Design a protein around this ligand. Structure first.
Ligand code: 1P8
Length: 119
């Protein structure tokens, strides 16, 4: 029932994500001058280095907040891809599935730890 365990679990999951070839387009912020369609359609840019930096700064209070930012990477990618005919689309779908598969136990364990704390 460790309330703090999620943080190292998220650090390790981000390490797996960065090693995966599918994360390459999502590792760093998009240059808004080079990709103006992203600039116009994306209200809140997000990328995995910003997620990792936020986590390391101690600026996430829960893994649910980290999960919201990672999900934003994928929803921004979906808004950017008008069809299935681009590698960004293919990579985003697979990386999202991998992330969701691995974050589920992190969220379950954290929510269980909070319920135990408040029991
Ligand atoms: O390097 C790039 C250019 C680019 C455009 C749009 C999206 Br979503 C991700 C990325 N990554």
């Amino acid at each position: 029932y460790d309330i703090q365990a999620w943080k190292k679990q998220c650090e390790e999951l981000l390490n797996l994500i960065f090693q995966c070839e599918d994360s390459e387009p999502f590792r760093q912020p998009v240059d808004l001058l080079e990709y103006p369609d992203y600039r116009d359609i994306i209200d809140t840019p997000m990328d995995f280095a910003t997620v990792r930096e936020t986590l390391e700064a101690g600026n996430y209070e829960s893994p649910m907040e980290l999960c919201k930012d990672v999900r934003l990477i994928f929803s921004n990618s979906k808004a950017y891809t008008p069809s299935k005919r681009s590698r960004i689309y293919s990579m985003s779908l697979r990386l999202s599935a991998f992330f969701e598969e691995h974050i589920s136990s992190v969220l379950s364990d954290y929510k269980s730890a909070l319920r135990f704390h408040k029991r």
